[PDB]
Each structure stands twice: as C-alpha cells, then as structure tokens.
Short mmCIF file of C-alpha atoms in Angstrom, two decimals:
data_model
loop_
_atom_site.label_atom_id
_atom_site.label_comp_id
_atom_site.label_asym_id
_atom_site.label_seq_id
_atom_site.Cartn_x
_atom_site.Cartn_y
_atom_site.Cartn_z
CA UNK A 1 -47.30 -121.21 62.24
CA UNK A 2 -47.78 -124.81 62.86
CA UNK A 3 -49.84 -126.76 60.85
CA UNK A 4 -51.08 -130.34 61.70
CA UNK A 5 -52.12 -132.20 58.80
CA UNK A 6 -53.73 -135.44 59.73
CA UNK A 7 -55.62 -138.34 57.28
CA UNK A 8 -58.62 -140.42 58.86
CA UNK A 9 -59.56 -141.46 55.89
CA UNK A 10 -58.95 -145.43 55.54
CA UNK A 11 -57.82 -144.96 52.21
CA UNK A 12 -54.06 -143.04 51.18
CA UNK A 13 -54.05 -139.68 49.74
CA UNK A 14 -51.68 -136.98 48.93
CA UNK A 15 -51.86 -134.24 50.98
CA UNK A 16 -50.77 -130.83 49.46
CA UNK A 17 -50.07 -127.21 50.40
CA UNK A 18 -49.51 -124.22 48.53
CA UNK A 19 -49.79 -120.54 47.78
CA UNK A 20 -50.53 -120.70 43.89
CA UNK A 21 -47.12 -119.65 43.09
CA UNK A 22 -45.01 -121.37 45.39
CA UNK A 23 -44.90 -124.68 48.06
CA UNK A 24 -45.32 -124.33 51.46
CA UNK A 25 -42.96 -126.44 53.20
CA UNK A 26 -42.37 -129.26 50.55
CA UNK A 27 -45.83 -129.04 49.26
CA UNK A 28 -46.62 -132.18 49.13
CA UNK A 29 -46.29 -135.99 50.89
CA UNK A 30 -48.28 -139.22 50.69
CA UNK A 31 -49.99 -140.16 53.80
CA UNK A 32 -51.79 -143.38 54.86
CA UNK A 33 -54.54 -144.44 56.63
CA UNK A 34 -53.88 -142.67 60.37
CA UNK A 35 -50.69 -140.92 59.52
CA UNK A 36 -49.91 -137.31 60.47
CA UNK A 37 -47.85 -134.76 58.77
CA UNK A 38 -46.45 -131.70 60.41
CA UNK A 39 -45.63 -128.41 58.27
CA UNK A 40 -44.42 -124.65 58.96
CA UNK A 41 -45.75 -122.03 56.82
CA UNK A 42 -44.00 -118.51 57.21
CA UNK A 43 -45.85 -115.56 59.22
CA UNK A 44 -47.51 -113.05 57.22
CA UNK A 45 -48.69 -115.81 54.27
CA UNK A 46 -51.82 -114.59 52.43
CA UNK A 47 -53.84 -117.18 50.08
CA UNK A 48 -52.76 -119.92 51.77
CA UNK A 49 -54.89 -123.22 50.85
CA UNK A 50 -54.39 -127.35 51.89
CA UNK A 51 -55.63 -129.90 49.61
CA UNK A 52 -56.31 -134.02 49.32
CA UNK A 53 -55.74 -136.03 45.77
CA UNK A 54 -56.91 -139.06 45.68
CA UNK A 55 -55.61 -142.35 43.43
CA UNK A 56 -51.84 -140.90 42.49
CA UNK A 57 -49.23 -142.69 40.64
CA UNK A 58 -45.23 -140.91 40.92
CA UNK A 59 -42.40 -142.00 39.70
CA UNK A 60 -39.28 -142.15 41.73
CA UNK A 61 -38.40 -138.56 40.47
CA UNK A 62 -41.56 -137.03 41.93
CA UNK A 63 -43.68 -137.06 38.18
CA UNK A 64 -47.15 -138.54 37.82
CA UNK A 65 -50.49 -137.72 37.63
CA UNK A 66 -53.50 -138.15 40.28
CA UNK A 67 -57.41 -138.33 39.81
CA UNK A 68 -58.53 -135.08 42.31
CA UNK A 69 -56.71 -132.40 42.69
CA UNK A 70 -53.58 -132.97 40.53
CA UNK A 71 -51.23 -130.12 40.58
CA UNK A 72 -49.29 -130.16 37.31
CA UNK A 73 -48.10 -133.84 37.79
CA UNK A 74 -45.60 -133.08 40.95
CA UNK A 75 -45.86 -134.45 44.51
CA UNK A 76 -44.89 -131.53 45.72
CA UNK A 77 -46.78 -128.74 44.67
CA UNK A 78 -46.34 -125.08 43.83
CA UNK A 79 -49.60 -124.21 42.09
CA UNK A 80 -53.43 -124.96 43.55
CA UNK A 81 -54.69 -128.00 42.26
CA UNK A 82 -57.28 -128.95 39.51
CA UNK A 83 -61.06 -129.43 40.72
CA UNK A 84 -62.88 -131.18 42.35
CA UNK A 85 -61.21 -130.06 45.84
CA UNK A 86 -62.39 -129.62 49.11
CA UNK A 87 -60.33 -126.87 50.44
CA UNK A 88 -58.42 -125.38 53.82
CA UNK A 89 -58.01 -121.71 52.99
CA UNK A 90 -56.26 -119.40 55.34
CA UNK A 91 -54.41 -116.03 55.88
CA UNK A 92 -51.73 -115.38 58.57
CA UNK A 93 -51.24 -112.16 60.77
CA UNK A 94 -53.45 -109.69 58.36
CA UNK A 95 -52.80 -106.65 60.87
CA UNK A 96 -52.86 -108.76 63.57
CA UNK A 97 -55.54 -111.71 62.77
CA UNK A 98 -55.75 -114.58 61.12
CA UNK A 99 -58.39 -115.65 58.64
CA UNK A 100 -59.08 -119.13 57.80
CA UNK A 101 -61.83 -121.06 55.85
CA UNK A 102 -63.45 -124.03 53.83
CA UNK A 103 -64.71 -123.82 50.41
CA UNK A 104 -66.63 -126.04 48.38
CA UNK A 105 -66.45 -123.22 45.62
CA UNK A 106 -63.77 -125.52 43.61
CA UNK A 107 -65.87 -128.86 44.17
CA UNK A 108 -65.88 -131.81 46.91
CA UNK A 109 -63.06 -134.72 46.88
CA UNK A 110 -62.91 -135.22 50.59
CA UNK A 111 -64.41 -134.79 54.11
CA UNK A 112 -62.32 -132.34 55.99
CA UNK A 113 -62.15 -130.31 59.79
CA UNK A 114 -60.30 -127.48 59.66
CA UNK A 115 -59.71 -126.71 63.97
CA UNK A 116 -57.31 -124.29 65.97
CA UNK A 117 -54.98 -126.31 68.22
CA UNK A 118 -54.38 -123.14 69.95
CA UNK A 119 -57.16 -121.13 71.60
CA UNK A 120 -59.36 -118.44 71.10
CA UNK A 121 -61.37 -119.36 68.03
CA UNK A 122 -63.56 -122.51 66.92
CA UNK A 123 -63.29 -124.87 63.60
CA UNK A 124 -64.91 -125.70 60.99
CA UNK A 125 -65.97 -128.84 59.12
CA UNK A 126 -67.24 -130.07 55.99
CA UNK A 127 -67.70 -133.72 56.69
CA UNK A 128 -71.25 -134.92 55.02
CA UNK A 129 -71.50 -137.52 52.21
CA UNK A 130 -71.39 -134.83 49.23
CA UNK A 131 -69.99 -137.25 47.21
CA UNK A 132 -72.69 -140.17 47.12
CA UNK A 133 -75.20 -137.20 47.25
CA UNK A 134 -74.24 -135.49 44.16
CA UNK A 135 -76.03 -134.59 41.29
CA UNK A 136 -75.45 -136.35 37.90
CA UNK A 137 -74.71 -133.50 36.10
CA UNK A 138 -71.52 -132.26 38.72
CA UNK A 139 -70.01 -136.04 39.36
CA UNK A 140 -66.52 -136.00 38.24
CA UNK A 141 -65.84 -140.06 36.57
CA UNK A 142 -62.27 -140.03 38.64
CA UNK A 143 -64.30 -139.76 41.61
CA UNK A 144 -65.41 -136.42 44.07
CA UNK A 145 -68.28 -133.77 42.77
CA UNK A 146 -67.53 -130.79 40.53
CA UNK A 147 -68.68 -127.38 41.04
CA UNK A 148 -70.56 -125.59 38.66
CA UNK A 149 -68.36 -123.34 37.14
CA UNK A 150 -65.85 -126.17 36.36
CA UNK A 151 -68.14 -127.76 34.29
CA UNK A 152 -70.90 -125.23 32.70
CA UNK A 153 -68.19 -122.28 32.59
CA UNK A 154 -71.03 -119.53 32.20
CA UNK A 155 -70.77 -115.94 34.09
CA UNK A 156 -73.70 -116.77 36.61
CA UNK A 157 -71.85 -119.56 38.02
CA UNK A 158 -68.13 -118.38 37.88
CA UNK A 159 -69.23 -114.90 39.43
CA UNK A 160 -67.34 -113.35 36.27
CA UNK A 161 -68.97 -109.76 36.64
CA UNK A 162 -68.63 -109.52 40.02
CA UNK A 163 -72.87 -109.86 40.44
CA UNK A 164 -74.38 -113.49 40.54
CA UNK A 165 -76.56 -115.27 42.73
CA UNK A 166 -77.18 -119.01 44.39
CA UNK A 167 -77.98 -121.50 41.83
CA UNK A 168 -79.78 -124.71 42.35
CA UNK A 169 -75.65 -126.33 42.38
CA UNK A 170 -74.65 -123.87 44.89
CA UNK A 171 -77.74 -124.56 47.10
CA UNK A 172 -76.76 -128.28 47.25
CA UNK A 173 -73.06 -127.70 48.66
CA UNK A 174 -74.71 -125.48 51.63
CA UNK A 175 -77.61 -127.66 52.15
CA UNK A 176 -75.05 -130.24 53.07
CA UNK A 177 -72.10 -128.35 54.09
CA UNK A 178 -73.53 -124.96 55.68
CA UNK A 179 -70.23 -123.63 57.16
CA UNK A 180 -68.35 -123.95 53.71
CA UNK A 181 -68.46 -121.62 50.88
CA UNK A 182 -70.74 -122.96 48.31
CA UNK A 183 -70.02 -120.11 45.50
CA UNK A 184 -68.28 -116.65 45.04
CA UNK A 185 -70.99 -114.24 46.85
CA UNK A 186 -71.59 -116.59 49.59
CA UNK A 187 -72.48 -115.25 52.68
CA UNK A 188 -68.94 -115.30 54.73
CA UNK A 189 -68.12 -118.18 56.48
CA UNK A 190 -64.40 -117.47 57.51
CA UNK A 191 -63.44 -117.60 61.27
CA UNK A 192 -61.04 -115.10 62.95
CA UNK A 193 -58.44 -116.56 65.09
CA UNK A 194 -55.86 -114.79 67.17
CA UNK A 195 -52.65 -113.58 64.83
CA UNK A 196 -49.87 -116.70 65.15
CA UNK A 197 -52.59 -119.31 65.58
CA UNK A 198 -51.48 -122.98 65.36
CA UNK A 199 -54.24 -125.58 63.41
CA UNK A 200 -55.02 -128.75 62.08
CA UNK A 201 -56.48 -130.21 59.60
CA UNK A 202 -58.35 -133.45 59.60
CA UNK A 203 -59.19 -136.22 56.49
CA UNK A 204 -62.22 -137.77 57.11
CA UNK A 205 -62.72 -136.69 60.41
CA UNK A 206 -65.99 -138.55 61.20
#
C-alpha cells in the first residue's frame, strides 16, 4: 500500500514510520513546511503506526536526539517513539480488511488527518488545539501534552489489569478529539477500509 505522508504544519518535523521492531520504508525523513513524502509498506503489515517529532538535531551519520517522539536517537526509525505522540495506527489486509486509527492514548505532539485516497471508507482527524488546552499536570516542557500513564504510571491509567475506566485525563483528549482513542478501553474508534487501501496522512491539516 501507498502511503502519502504530507506536513501542513509551518514549522519542520520528522516524520516517522514503523512497526516496533522494524522501519517501514526508511523510517524516517525530515520534511518542511508543505513538503510531501511518499512510502510503501508491505501487504499483510499488522501494528503499523506514523509519527511527527518535533525540534531534532542529526548528525551527518543519522544520530541525534529530538524533543517529541524520539526513537532511540535515529532518523530513521525501527522502534515506536517516546511520548507525547499523536499517532496513525493501521493494519493491512486482516482477512481481507484493513483497520486504521488515531490515538491520543500515547499523548498529543501534533494535529493530524488520517484519510483514504482510495474509496470506500472515510478519515479521521485529530486537529483541535490540545496542546494550548492542556492541563498543567500532563504538559511535557519540550513541548506537546502527555498522557496519563506516561507520567502517573499507576494501573488505572495504564489499563495494567485489563479493567480500568475514563479518568478526568482521558475525558479531556475525547472532549477535544472525539474520534481518537483517549485511553486503553475506549470505545472503538477504528475505521474499516477495503483490503489494499491507499491513505494519507496530513500535519496540521487545518
């Protein structure tokens, strides 16, 4: 499948993609203000998930470090990246379907539409001001807003036993970003599409 990948945003970030134990495609690539990068990801790839970071630094060997999202200090990425990150999640051809999704259940960084450029299915966004919005205890100092388990690290938040409820943190990522997952048990929000679907995603797509 085809994958789109396109920033808005009127500031640079590094785009990345990955299955948690490998790249997709080269995994990552810096992209400014209005630029567009186009990946293939293999048929049949389960746990699929795109990512922003924001404020980077690399060397000319690929090393650094960045402020959201950092994945082990590598532009390209093979493992997900640390919180806070808005996230693209998606599955490809599961028995003829694909299954694709945002979640706010690792934090906020940046604004993000997650569409079909193919048909037969509809998108989804995440595009309010969670940032500017969030509350004191969840902002992250290198910018974007934390989920709850990231910082507090207690079973109710982190869904440990497999039982756990909204929380006044969860209820503020819905409030402002209904069609996102806002914490483990959430109420589904995943779209099917039609097996082989093409897609894009969108930075800052307001």
């Amino acid at each position: 499948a085809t994958f789109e990948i396109v920033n808005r945003c009127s500031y640079t970030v590094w785009a990345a993609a990955s299955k948690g134990d490998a790249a997709l495609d080269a995994g990552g690539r810096q992209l400014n203000s209005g630029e567009s990068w186009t990946i293939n990801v293999e048929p049949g790839t389960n746990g699929g998930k795109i990512w922003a970071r924001t404020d980077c630094y690399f060397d000319d060997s690929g090393s650094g470090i960045c402020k959201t999202g950092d994945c082990g200090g590598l532009l390209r990425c093979k493992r997900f990246g640390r919180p806070p990150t808005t996230l693209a999640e998606f599955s490809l051809n599961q028995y003829g379907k694909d299954y694709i999704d945002i979640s706010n259940i690792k934090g906020f960084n940046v604004p993000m539409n997650f569409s079909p450029t193919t048909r037969g299915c509809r998108g989804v966004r995440c595009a309010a001001d969670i940032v500017g919005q969030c509350p004191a205890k969840l902002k992250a100092p290198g910018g974007g807003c934390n989920d709850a388990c990231t910082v507090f690290q207690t079973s109710e938040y982190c869904c440990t036993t497999g039982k756990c409820g909204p929380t006044e943190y969860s209820r503020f990522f819905k409030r402002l970003c209904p069609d996102a997952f806002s914490y483990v048990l959430d109420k589904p929000t995943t779209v099917t599409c039609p097996g082989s679907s093409n897609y894009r995603v969108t930075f800052c797509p307001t």
